[PDB]
Amino acid sequence: NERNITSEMRESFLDYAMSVIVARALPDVRDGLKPVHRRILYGLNEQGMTPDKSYKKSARIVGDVMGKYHPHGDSSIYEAMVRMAQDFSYRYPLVDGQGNFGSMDGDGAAAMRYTEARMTKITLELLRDINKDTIDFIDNYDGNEREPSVLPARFPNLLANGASGIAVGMATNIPPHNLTELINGVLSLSKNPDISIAELMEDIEGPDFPTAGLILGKSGIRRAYETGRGSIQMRSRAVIEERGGGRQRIVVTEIPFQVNKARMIEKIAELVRDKKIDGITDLRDETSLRTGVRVVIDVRKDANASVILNNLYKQTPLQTSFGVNMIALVNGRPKLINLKEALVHYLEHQKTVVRRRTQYNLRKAKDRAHILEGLRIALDHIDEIISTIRESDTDKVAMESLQQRFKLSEKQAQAILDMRLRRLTGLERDKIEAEYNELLNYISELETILADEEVLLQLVRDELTEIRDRFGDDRRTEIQL
Amino acid sequence: INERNITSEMRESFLDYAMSVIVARALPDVRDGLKPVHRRILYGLNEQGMTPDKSYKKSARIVGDVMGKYHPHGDSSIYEAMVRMAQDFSYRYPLVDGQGNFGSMDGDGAAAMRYTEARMTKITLELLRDINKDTIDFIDNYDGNEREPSVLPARFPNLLANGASGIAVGMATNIPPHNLTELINGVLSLSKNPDISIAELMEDIEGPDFPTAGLILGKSGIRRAYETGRGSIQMRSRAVIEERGGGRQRIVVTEIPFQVNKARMIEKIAELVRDKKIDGITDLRDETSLRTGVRVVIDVRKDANASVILNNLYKQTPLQTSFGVNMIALVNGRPKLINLKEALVHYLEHQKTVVRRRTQYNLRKAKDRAHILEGLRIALDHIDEIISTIRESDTDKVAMESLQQRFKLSEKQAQAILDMRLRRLTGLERDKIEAEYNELLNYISELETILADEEVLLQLVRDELTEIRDRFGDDRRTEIQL
Amino acid sequence: GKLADCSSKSPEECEIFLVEGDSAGGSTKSGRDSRTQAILPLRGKILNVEKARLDRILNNNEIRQMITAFGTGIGGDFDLAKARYHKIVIMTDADVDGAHIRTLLLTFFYRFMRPLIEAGYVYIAQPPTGYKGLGEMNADQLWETTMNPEHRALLQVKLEDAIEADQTFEMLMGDVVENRRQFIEDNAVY
Amino acid sequence: KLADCSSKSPEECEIFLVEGDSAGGSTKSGRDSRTQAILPLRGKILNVEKARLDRILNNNEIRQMITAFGTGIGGDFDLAKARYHKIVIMTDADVDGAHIRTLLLTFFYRFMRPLIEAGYVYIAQPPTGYKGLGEMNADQLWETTMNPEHRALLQVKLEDAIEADQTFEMLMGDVVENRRQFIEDNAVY
DNA sequence: GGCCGTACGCT
DNA sequence: AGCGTAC
DNA sequence: GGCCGTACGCTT
DNA sequence: GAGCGTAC
Ligand SMILES: C[C@@H]1CN2c3ccc([N+](=O)[O-])cc3CC3(C(=O)NC(=O)NC3=O)[C@H]2[C@H](C)O1
Ligand SMILES: C[C@@H]1CN2c3ccc([N+](=O)[O-])cc3CC3(C(=O)NC(=O)NC3=O)[C@H]2[C@H](C)O1
Ligand SMILES: [Mn+2]
Ligand SMILES: [Mn+2]
Ligand code: NA
């Protein structure tokens, strides 16, 4: 048939626009992940790529993720993953990479066949309990596999590592933070639902970039937290020092977040070359894997090196702003959220995650208990049990007879028929009665949690505090003034 | 200790490389007719459950597994080899089944491996048949973290079937494809006559049989190739002369020579016309299509002798090409120039060994099973005491011991009894054990009979080969003209 | 990257396929009827002309590749009689990215070759729906399901309104995010 | 393309010739920038024992080395202009990496012979094992292979010119048969 | 996703 | 202006 | 193995 | 020739 131009444009564009939006370019407020990042980690999970076990070829990992969950170009997948392994990109890195994974000089990682990976220990905390019905799974694209809609995310990852993503009709820009400060902010909130931003800012000072450096003033920060939008002045950590002979140099040891060191330097070299900046006699990168970042700028003798530096902030990315735009997927729709909203949604998710865990651990402990009761019965009347089976011609017949005589469930009776003879030795019998008693206590432990809303909550608190204590680190970025 | 002699370094360094390329890269094994990259791909396809019944898997996953586990080289060499095996214009008997763009006679490339999928061909299964019955020797993989085979059971003569080409160091190899029907028949004839002449063998095996088909000129090239291992065989396209209207004519080409790129060949023709090297041609057209098949059309000016123009394209273009047969293969881990019969003998002998080893593996296996069944028999008959013995026992070890004492059961027998599930105690189950035991006993005899007579083993090999011929035998594609 | 033309030089019976990606383009060329079907692959997303300036648009290789291929010229210089194919067929993956690429091509035409649509030279192919895209399927099925006239269903593009059509392109592809963002907020069925 | 050390003093400056652009990148970060320069090599390089001068002088790879050494070739070879006093061959611990090593030696021997006699040319000794250079951490490459405190280099020594002249011609030569004989004589299988 | 280097033997 | 997922 | 194309939005 | 086919 025919197709009207106006309606095909409207419809085509929207299918695209909605897709980039809800399934590519924007993170989920609960785990702070985009589709590509989540599937990679879920891929490290299911491929058993834990920190204890050995690295695995990056090509093999990416192939799995693309064959099973992510039907998109392989380059898209690999570079997202590469970024997770970079301690200058992720405030709390999620991939543990072996091989060349790039550097601040904007040099890329080597090709995936040359590199290997596994999780970092903190990734483990993202997926912890993923298999205890804590989160809803979904069909994969071809319907072959199930994948997670979201991760347990037992630390508040959206804010920890931030997110930058350009969608259609919108985009997001969320900066990293200090894990410790975040969790404390979370804990504070759980004790006060009507907590203000101001009071949250007692715990969370501001953004904390993997790259360290300096922030200028609190106002941009302040505005960004109250609205979800604001400008943050990021400066480099630079000092002026004598090189001897009455000559000084400027030395730079930290650079702004998401700034290419190399490119910034060529920007300076270019300004000197074109004479748009007076007073510089030499420029060197002394950065070594041992001595860390160190960029040097020799100042012509008797030149005021402070003034030069000032202009260097004016004319190069030595100072750069970070435009905070905090749009995240909330209930499957794009929303601009202030800081408190960001924490509120994360908290509700940890509530549901631990609740669902505890309920799942229960179902399954009762499921196993029921079985052990079925086995104990058998141990008690083992002679009768045997008689009953031996006198049965068929397993189904034996199933029926066993259910009828000893008043068993079908499950209990199947279990008995599958029981190996060695389970009758002294120790094997003790093991069954020992598992059961331990299990009865567990059940009643679990039932307590679910019987009180506050117990549950405090459990969540403790479980955070623990993560905070193991993983929380020092603030890197200095907030001046 | 800081010092290296340039002469000594060069000799050692070059030899290590040359040796490696020769025995572990560029040359095929005389037995499965595979190079290492190819052997590992098919092993991997097997290790991964990529059988014809199973659905296609993305080629990138396959390559990563092949790379990561067996083959520590560039994924391009890998995927490319795999792609060749899936092209019916490359493989006389393709071993890979590809979904997606795997490329063309013109020779475009396959799509990158993230676009394509694959799995085994039904014929490949026959290379892997019995591989898990200790028929062939496994070895350590490079990182020593895995095991790979040193060769495949290769239940058909694959070296000669698909052939091989490879540039080694100090040597090269060129071996053409053949008709499997004629191939197996050759072997059958060898097996009944350890003294058969090449000439006689050639009663079965006429000559090569290219997937691209086409024609061969004369039997002399083939005979020299088969007697000595080297020789020039002349590969002519299938072209006919036909009328097009107005009393004018055209040459139509429908089968080109093996390993010739159709497009490149066409360019050469075009170039000759442009450069005035040839005369009488007014047009050139590839009308190849999937339905039509390969059709290349050359238009001839009226009153110009086509058959003459034709001869000139044979002389002046790849339209006629030479296959320089140079039959070098790994024999006993060493490169050797073999003739036809030599080829067929190292194959056959492989098969005797493979069938013998399989039979022996089965035997040990069946005898093992029986032993266990005997132990179970005893337990079911004496079950009440057996159960009591275990209940009294405080551990497995205690139970083991007592059972062996009272019933003179073996350690493995008792172990099987302690692992028995209760459901095996139903009345029907006792009958099932008995039936299984009886079949086994018969089975054991059968197997023993084969081991007892080398002739019986040999006939078994003959019978198994013949079934493959009947199932996978097909018609000779290449015509031989004298 | 390189157009593959057909045999026939008579535009009445000629059709040109704008394919998505060079792996799909390669498959298409084998599968096609080379006698009447010319294929031009496009490598990924193409320039959004609505958002770009003239010097850039003219210089861009993809835009240029198609103008040369159609043989009409653009704007005031357009000559529908200079068209080398009476069918220009958009063949993109059955996915959102393919569908994006679609809106981008349609943006170009309606803006630079508007007479070509009104002439109904512009069609949309319709390959198999589902998760597999064009580069993942065989050349024998690309032909039998999308290119082969005997079975294929193409979609001739028509335009009843031009003022509405001008607002749409401007709204959807224009450089004003907000009118786009509002349109998404009004038709968003999450 | 080359990554060069800051120091302009040849005596103390070393250029590593590294196999692959993966290994090259790791090496640039890993190396000590003061004294250590890196020229990566994109795979197998031209065998000059088989090539004529025209081609050799047009080879990108061959051209980059000439330029980087700045000593000139043949009679014009001026060991005095050597921009590095240590020229290091760094390849994988596999047979391909050893092949590459023989490709380089042939060249030095045939065009910068005095460079060897001066003992300027060395062979690195990375971990023998199952990992290529482009798979190792940069920090790992530095300590094992590159840090002069820990590394074990092999200075290449030329004992005898006639013996060296005959061997290069046999091993890298255009005539296959003598190479085939050499293998046949010396293969242990 | 494509274009391109190189070695290696043979014809 | 260039961050980062896509083709 | 390294080049390089495009769309998408944006800091009160 | 230059291109077959595994490698860097
Ligand atoms: C599939 C590719 C083929 N390849 C190519 C390809 C092209 C060129 N070239 O154009 O100079 C050089 C090399 C040499 C090559 C390269 O590009 N880079 C490198 O570092 N090593 C290589 O062998 C090689 C790589 C590893 O694999
Ligand atoms: C990782 C690569 C990136 N890429 C590139 C890369 C470079 C260019 N380019 O320089 O014009 C175009 C495209 C467009 C691109 C391509 O090269 N070919 C293609 O067919 N489609 C694409 O989107 C794309 C491919 C699929 O994936
Ligand atoms: Mn697609
Ligand atoms: Mn290597
Ligand atoms: Na010829």
Numbering used by the authors:
A (entry chain C): 10 to 490
B (entry chain A): 9 to 490
C (entry chain D): 416 to 545, 580 to 639
D (entry chain B): 417 to 545, 580 to 639
Study authors write:
Bacteria have two well-conserved topo2As, DNA gyrase and topoisomerase IV (topo IV), which allow for dual targeting by antibacterials, affording reduced spontaneous resistance. DNA gyrase consists of two subunits, GyrA and GyrB, and functions as an A2B2 tetramer, as does topo IV, which consists of ParC and ParE subunits. Topo2As regulate DNA topology by creating a four base-pair-staggered double-stranded break (DSB) in one DNA duplex, passing another DNA duplex through this break and then resealing the break. As part of a structure-based approach to develop novel bacterial topo2A pharmacophores, we co-crystallized and determined structures of DNA-cleavage complexes of the S. aureus B27-A56(GKdel) fusion truncate (gyraseCORE) with QPT-1, etoposide and moxifloxacin.
With etoposide and moxifloxacin, we solved 2.80 and 2.95 Å DNA-cleavage complex structures in a P21 unit cell with two complexes in the asymmetric unit. With QPT-1, in addition to solving a 3.15-Å structure in this P21 cell, we also solved a 2.50-Å QPT-1 structure in a P61 cell with one complex in the asymmetric unit; the three QPT-1 complexes were similar but not identical (see bottom line of Table 1 (for nomenclature) and below). The three different QPT-1 cleavage complexes have the DNA gate closed in different ways. These complexes (ba_ba'2–QPT, BA_BA'2–QPT and BA_BA'2−QPT) come from the 2.5- and 3.15-Å QPT-1 co-crystal structures, which were obtained under the same crystallization conditions. Similar to the fluoroquinolones, QPT-1 is bound between the +1 and −1 bases at the DNA cleavage site inhibiting DNA re-ligation. QPT-1 interacts with residues in the TOPRIM domain of GyrB, with the barbituric acid moiety of QPT-1 packing under Arg458 and making a hydrogen bond to the main-chain N–H of Asp437, and quite a close interaction with the main-chain CH2 of Gly436. QPT-1 also makes an indirect hydrogen bond via a water molecule to the side chain of Asp437. In QPT-1, the barbituric acid moiety sits in a pocket between the DNA and protein, and interacts with the main-chain N–H of Asp437 from GyrB; this explains why QPT-1 is active against fluoroquinolone-resistant strains and suggests ways of developing new members of this class. When the QPT-1-binding sites are compared, the largest difference is seen in the relative position of the G1 nucleotide, which is covalently attached to the catalytic tyrosine from the opposing subunit. The two S. aureus gyrase complexes with two etoposides bound (BA_BA'2–etop and BA_BA'2–etop) were both in the half-open Casym conformation.
